[PDB]
Amino acid sequence: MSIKCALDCDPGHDDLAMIMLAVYSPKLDVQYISTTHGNQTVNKTYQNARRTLNLIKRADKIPVYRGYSKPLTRESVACPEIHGESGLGGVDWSEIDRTMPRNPALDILGYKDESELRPDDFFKHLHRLVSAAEDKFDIISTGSETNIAQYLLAYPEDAKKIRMTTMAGNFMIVGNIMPFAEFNVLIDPEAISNILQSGVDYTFAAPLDITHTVLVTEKVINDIKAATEPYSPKFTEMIIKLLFFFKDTYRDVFGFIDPPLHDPVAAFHLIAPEWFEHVRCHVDIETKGEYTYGCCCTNLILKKKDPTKIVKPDNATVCLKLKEGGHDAFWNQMITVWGEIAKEIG
Amino acid sequence: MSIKCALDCDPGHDDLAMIMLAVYSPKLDVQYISTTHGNQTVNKTYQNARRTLNLIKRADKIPVYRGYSKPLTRESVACPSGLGGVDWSEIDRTMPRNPALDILGYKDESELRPDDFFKHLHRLVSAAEDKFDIISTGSETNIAQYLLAYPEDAKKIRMTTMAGNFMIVGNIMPFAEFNVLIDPEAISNILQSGVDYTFAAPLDITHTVLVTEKVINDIKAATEPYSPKFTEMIIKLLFFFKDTYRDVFGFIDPPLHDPVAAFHLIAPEWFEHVRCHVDIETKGEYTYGCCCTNLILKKKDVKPDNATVCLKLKEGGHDAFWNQMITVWGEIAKEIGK
Amino acid sequence: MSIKCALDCDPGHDDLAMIMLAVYSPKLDVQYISTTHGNQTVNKTYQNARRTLNLIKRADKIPVYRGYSKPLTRESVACPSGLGGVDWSEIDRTMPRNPALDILGYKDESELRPDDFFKHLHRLVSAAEDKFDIISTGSETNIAQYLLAYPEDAKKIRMTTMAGNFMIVGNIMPFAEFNVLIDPEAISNILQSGVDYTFAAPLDITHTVLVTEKVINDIKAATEPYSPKFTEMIIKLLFFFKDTYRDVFGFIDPPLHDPVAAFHLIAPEWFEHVRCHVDIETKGEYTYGCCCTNLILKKKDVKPDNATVCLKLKEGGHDAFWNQMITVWGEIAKEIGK
Amino acid sequence: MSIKCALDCDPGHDDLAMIMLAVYSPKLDVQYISTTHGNQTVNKTYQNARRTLNLIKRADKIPVYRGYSKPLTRESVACPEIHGESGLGGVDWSEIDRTMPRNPALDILGYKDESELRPDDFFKHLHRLVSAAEDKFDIISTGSETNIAQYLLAYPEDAKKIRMTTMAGNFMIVGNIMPFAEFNVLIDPEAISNILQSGVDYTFAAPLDITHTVLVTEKVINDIKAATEPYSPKFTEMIIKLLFFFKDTYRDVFGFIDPPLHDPVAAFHLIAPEWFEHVRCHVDIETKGEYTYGCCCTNLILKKKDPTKIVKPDNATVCLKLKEGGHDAFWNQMITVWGEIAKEIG
């Protein structure tokens, strides 16, 4: 039984890997991809999502929506377009760009071209899916969560029928872009704060706690090559170059011998949650902090001290680690998908 | 010579008067009304806008959109009619179909969504030669949401609002006014967006626009020869909160707020204007929604101007305002009849 | 029948008038003056307090303490005299020894430390039958610092202050008054401490206490027969900021703030009083120091009262105030002579 | 050459160990001890400091001051005295209490008894020491830093002649009592914020980053016993019981097999700084955060990225780790002191 889902993301090298996993996994039935602002503008993340789909021969099959350009109440941190940063550095996209098929979203919306795309386009599609869902509809989110916050402001009564599985936050280790907070939260902390208060069933499936243990080592690289290079050496090198585009920065700035892979871990949670530990708690997102906005603050310590003197209700599930065998299961899943993509590319 | 505009509001007795003025004024060509959350839910403010239109025989002419139910990042203050003082049961049951439904291709009102108005506003903004005029007299959540979806449209929008207090204190909170403090982040966003923003009717002005005995007698004189029923309805609505204004707020005669903003679009020559930088307080625990300006620092001598503020009506302005309102009420009375 | 008290202030022309009133009034028995930071450094406010005392022939009688140089957790706004309008060179060079030095066992003023006043105040608080009275007319940093060192003394202190604005807007910032906004955490601490706190002279009152032509002529009549030199000094000091008050703040005639707080201790029957909960804004970016009350919620109907607020002088109060001030100025004039 | 210093602390089991190290080390010449509010009231921390001194036969030699009872602008987190918590649980102090000699501070101040002690008593003594110092005067701080903040408000011109060595903060790991902040900072973040802005030469000598690696293991316990029990078995058991009083809480709540020892690490920095790594940076203390007040936020990442595009001047030294051999050097120092104390007790 396949699980219908939507992907909300900001590709982004990590997000590209997540899309690949979600789309090629037979267990996930991707209905649409919506893109958000991030390190680059939402127009660039839109193009990068479509680049990903076209590379894997699915750009004619999956509608892609271009979402909101900035946070709810804060400024974008996106580079100016005059920096000339694609957001998917490391490879030449010129062939993928020029062979790009028509976006199926355009026909859904009755638009003639992509210049008509508006941030709230995805709303009606998501509402159809939420309404049709027997229990809850599954959204995988691996960038800022502005798009989902905007949706819930327009459709508050849908919150109770949405399940979110995200790459976001840090709990028992420190942050990345800021001392104690993670990029996806700190770029729009009000958005995640809204979502947690809305009635959404929210899982922090892939915080830094987990993703910093999911490292692209030499062993992983050789496993990738073994699975892909017999079928498409060109795809092999593309995927390696993308995985290692920020390897120097991770090493020199962040002390990483081998770089982490974040976003696909969230999709893996929807595919195979048995590999993850889970704990329910109350998560407060810092919004007032001058230096600490986006911190994910929990009552986990108070639960381990004095369980039934706890005031605030649980509003989230947090996955703090993978179980034994979980890392191997994750890499086997990713390698399988990359192998299948390699076969289709040829 | 008419000015195309949209009304964003939360009726509300004040907003009802503003709708009447804007719609019946030949100078303002109302394209649509969007409603927002306030003291009452956005579903109630929606119905109240439609009640107003149907009372004045325009519910078949003007599309009404139902907007956002809560602030961007704060909780609603809406309670479980919003237009007390009269019986709306006949107006409700004779209500014609909302023209917005045909614009949207909807079969019924349950399909209305908060972002419905977006495409209509964008068409109007795109078609405008200079800027398109929006009159806003409730929370500004709807416009903030619009600008998040259409950021490039900010530079082609002109906003005329009833909002804020500057040289006097607030109403619902010590130093802030209801429309701002209910969603301060919204107005903060708008001021930063590139919108041409005028605080046309802060409390500074509206607390001098008072429904006195003289005003009531002028209303009666203009309306009661044509529709005694409308006369009493409008008086009952104007005085629904008179005791609360007296006992809570020290008002001998109650203020009328929102129509003053529409009057600014009709006849701005009656208003004083000053340009300044307005900072909206969002971090304050007790002072969120305060409109803080650099007006004092300008009179002594950094931050660029982001708004126009109208601090008073000029001599003759109050009389001009009441003459305009009474004229419109007179015309409505004629259309309603006995 | 006299009331023992201490003055905490930042002279300042207003504070100078307050010192004069408190010291020469037979109803107030001034034990000491402590000075605080303000527009000028605490070292300058110290000298200005001593200048005031020496002008009125009391610098040998009243110990003056030099208090804290900056707010608890914010930066000073002090610039690199603080009593412009007159030449103090003679008053400075004839300055007698500060009696505080002998109380402290110090040889010279360079040994003065901000916490020097603490032991003296504690002796007074301990000896008080009920509560000891402090008049405060600058930042309240000194008293906040005292209460951090002597928390158990809070319940035996009564504070009468010039501070805040409630039903009108602020001065130096849009919605807040100078004395609060310079150290809002200090007043926040004090209100939470158990001190019996009265906002005796907010802007609400002091902006109605105006140095008009009539006042100036009453001053001249009372002083100039005894000391024409003192007459001109006091007028020049009262009108040093008259142009700025007019041009910046719209004042035809300038206000006199701080002495109104001392007048409250002398004759409280001239003031209206209301009890409420005051929250001091500390988190606001543009609104820190706002005095936010539950007065509106009380007139509609949770948080316990923590202050008394005087919102107006009663009929006759302004005349009683000016009669008291002019009497004191007359007595000072007599002691100075020609 | 001995280094004159003052100790500001809130004993506290950790603080007790720090006092022992500082007082019995010949390299540190302790001038006075000032106590602050913490988990218990400042009156209890005062008594606990005097208990420590009397146990080690120094209560007649070192003046102890009782400092401020609460933070600058926040409420105390001290238990009510009706909880009946000493603040030095694990041993019976009744003999130490009744043999307590007169506090030398009383004669310095001209007081007849301890009930006359006031929070600002230490000010004049510290100012004498700061004035006499050739370069800067050294303060070791291992609780809330309210006392030093209060001092600097009264003596702002002394800031430039004070060097502070503290146990405080967490940088590259998460907090203890709150998700991302450490107890000593979060109890009065405004105090440390004031100090960093004042011109004090400030070293975070012992953040959790270090102290969570300084663990009282079985090996340590046996080394203690070997050094002390031949001279005073009673002292041996006292010190062990104190070191392990919170062992269960550390294990069950915080995942510690063996418990950390915090405060003495700060004194060890003044004794032997060569065992510590140092980095200069700008530290911002979060004061506005609702859930994150007391977070120590640094520009260390921006230094490793783009050194000479840094705006804010350095205001602190941070010690992020001990060098190789540092842990062993620390334990050798502590064991030596405990051995010497054992010999004096007999």
Ligand SMILES: Cc1cn([C@@H]2O[C@H](CO)[C@@H](O)[C@H]2O)c(=O)[nH]c1=O
């Ligand atoms: C290396 C890198 C990562 N990311 C995103 O950060 C999130 C984790 O903090 C991931 O979703 C990744 O896509 C970016 O947005 N930009 C980058 O240059």
Ligand SMILES: Cc1cn([C@@H]2O[C@H](CO)[C@@H](O)[C@H]2O)c(=O)[nH]c1=O
């Ligand atoms: C008396 C009153 C006023 N208002 C709105 O407050 C704004 C002024 O602060 C106006 O737009 C008015 O509609 C309400 O929403 N409800 C009321 O009961």
Ligand SMILES: Cc1cn([C@@H]2O[C@H](CO)[C@@H](O)[C@H]2O)c(=O)[nH]c1=O
């Ligand atoms: C005009 C003026 C007033 N003040 C103080 O502001 C307070 C009122 O907000 C008074 O205590 C007055 O001393 C000053 O400190 N400096 C000034 O130049």
Ligand SMILES: Cc1cn([C@@H]2O[C@H](CO)[C@@H](O)[C@H]2O)c(=O)[nH]c1=O
């Ligand atoms: C176990 C424990 C430790 N502490 C203090 O926490 C600081 C580190 O966060 C140390 O200075 C320790 O004294 C306390 O104040 N109370 C305790 O119960």
Ligand SMILES: O=S(=O)(O)CCN1CCN(CCS(=O)(=O)O)CC1
């Ligand atoms: O009553 S008022 O004069 O204020 C507004 C009436 N006005 C005229 C009719 N349409 C224009 C034609 S269409 O472009 O909307 O179809 C908008 C509404």
Ligand SMILES: O=S(=O)(O)CCN1CCN(CCS(=O)(=O)O)CC1
């Ligand atoms: O000029 S005023 O009347 O306002 C204050 C004069 N007052 C009398 C003298 N001492 C009391 C004796 S002692 O207790 O201070 O020594 C305090 C000062």
Ligand SMILES: [Ca+2]
């Ligand atoms: Ca991402």
Ligand SMILES: [Ca+2]
């Ligand atoms: Ca309204």
Ligand SMILES: [Ca+2]
């Ligand atoms: Ca003053």
Ligand SMILES: [Ca+2]
């Ligand atoms: Ca400690």
Ligand SMILES: [Mg+2]
């Ligand atoms: Mg799939």
Ligand SMILES: [Mg+2]
């Ligand atoms: Mg019209």
Ligand SMILES: [Mg+2]
């Ligand atoms: Mg007197």
Ligand SMILES: [Mg+2]
């Ligand atoms: Mg020693």
Ligand code: NI
């Ligand atoms: Ni860039």
Ligand code: NI
């Ligand atoms: Ni307790």
